[PDB]
């Protein structure tokens, strides 16, 4: 199946305090592997997965220097952006940056990303061609002109299509027992009587990896979406995921309904029906 | 592995 590597950076100004907060995390697929937090005592990039600990001191030193370069860049950006939006020196503001790459089942480059947000909305993003920019508003055109002039896209492209994907492959290999595993969902259905007139059927998928999954309801083999609820896929805390989907049905009509479960660990999708 | 080149906005 497909895989991704992504880095997420959050930069929060703290006026009155105290230097801005800077948090960086890296992910391979749905598995976090490194962190850095400005407020932590180490001031180092830290391992957050067992397989990354195999990397020697050159790596940790290198990543620490680079994440501090990112921190410092973001330190300057908070001021620059406050200037672009004619904002006061006394209000907290949030900058986020995300970049990374996707590979297909043959582990070849599929797509690259590099986007930037300010105060909860898009600021500037690299387009899928990895050659042009989308600026979200008037202020971001300044940055767009700036980055076009400096060939920032070409620089990002070289990393995204090259270094990004090669390290992703390395991680996938080194942490294969974790990252290349498929844990098929453990499934079951529960039944709860709302009253004499209705019952809720809830279809569960537990202890699965990777997070990608689809849960759907049918009634008489027709897709059923009305009176249905689907929660966000959620972390179990042990490296696996959980999800459920529910439908409210008329009393006596439970057997019409089926839950359908699709997941990489399932050769064929599962079909579940209430078993009283 | 992180990008080493980061341009200011």
């Amino acid at each position, epitope marked *: 199946g497909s895989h991704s590597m992504r880095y997420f950076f959050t930069s929060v100004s703290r006026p009155g305090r105290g230097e801005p907060r800077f948090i960086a995390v890296g992910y391979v697929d749905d598995t976090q592997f490194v962190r850095f937090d400005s407020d932590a005592a180490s001031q180092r990039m830290e391992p957050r997965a067992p397989w990354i600990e195999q990397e020697g001191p*050159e790596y940790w*030193d*290198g990543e620490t*220097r*680079k994440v501090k*370069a990112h921190s*410092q*860049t973001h330190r*300057v950006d908070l001021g620059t952006l406050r200037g672009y939006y004619n904002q006061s020196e006394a209000g907290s503001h949030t900058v986020q940056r995300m970049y990374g790459c996707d590979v297909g089942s043959d582990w070849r480059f599929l797509r690259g990303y590099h986007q930037y947000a300010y105060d909860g909305k898009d600021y500037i993003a690299l387009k899928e061609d990895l050659r042009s920019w989308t600026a979200a508003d008037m202020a971001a055109q300044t940055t767009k002109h700036k980055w076009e002039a*400096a*060939h*920032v896209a*070409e*620089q990002l492209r*070289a*990393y995204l*299509e*090259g*270094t990004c994907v*090669e*390290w992703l492959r390395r991680y996938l290999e080194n942490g294969k027992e974790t990252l290349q595993r498929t844990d098929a969902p453990k499934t079951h259905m529960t039944h709860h009587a709302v009253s004499d007139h209705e019952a809720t059927l809830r279809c569960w998928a537990l202890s699965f990896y990777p997070a990608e999954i689809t849960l759907t309801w049918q009634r008489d083999g027709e897709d059923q979406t009305q009176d249905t609820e689907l929660v966000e896929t959620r972390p179990a805390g042990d490296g696996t995921f959980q999800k459920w989907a529910a439908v409210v049905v008329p009393s006596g009509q439970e057997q019409r309904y089926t839950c359908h479960v699709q997941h990489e660990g399932l050769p064929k999708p599962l079909t579940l029906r209430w078993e009283p | 592995s992180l*990008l*080493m*080149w*980061i*341009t*200011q906005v």
Partner: antibody, heavy 119, light 110 residues
């Protein structure tokens, strides 16, 4: 024991191209971020381009963007600079140089190869 | 251009000190703590002597010291000796590239 040895420098007409090579020996070349730095006769040092240890990710001075391409191959312990659209102002001694860690400053250097851009 | 500005020349008699300034902007010198200094003797490749603003490379005595304040880094050479005569260049990370200063010739008088 540690050595970087450049070659490929020579005379080329304005608008022309040249490829430089740098053969590394006596250190683990594959772990160093590599750069090209040039120095015009009687003039100061100018960083030209750099490439990460694994190859792929690169960076260039404004003065050479779109014209130069840096590359390496770790199996041959060699660094390359392909230079296109050459200008009289590209005339210089070109050094190959490396750093183990990012942002440290290059501490292993070659001896330079001379490029002359002239009609 | 983006250059890192240094003085053309500084000098001192043996035993004295010189200081060499290196000024950039928040894009570089003022933005990061990744300033280095190089010594280059005639007909030789540059040698790294200082990295990470203040850290001396192997073999470099404490009489060479680096610092910075705001947008300006400094190299001070105390206890000046004849063999200190050379060109000195500062250097900085600048986000999307590296950049050297314009270089300073150090003369040892007498």
């Amino acid at each position: 024991e540690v050595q970087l040895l450049e070659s490929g420098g020579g005379l080329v007409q304005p608008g022309g191209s040249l490829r430089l090579s740098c053969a590394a020996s006596g250190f683990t070349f594959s772990t160093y971020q590599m750069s090209w730095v040039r120095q015009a006769p009687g003039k100061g040092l100018e960083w030209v381009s750099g490439i990460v240890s694994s190859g792929g990710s690169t960076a260039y001075a404004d003065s050479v963007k779109g014209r130069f391409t840096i590359s390496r191959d770790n199996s041959k312990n060699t660094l390359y600079l392909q230079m296109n659209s050459l200008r009289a102002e590209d005339t210089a001694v070109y050094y190959c140089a490396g750093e183990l860690l990012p942002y440290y400053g290059m501490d292993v250097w070659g001896q330079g190869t001379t490029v002359t851009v002239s009609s | 251009q983006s250059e890192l500005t240094q003085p053309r020349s500084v000098s001192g008699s043996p035993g004295q000190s010189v200081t060499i300034s290196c000024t950039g902007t928040s894009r570089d010198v003022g933005g990061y703590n990744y300033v280095s200094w190089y010594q280059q003797h005639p007909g030789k490749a540059p040698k790294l002597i200082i990295h990470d603003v203040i850290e001396r490379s192997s073999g470099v005595p404490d009489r060479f010291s680096g610092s910075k304040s705001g947008n300006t880094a400094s190299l001070t050479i105390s206890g000046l000796q004849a063999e200190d005569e050379a060109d000195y260049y500062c250097w900085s990370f600048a986000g999307s590239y590296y950049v050297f200063g314009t270089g300073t010739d150090v003369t040892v008088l007498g």
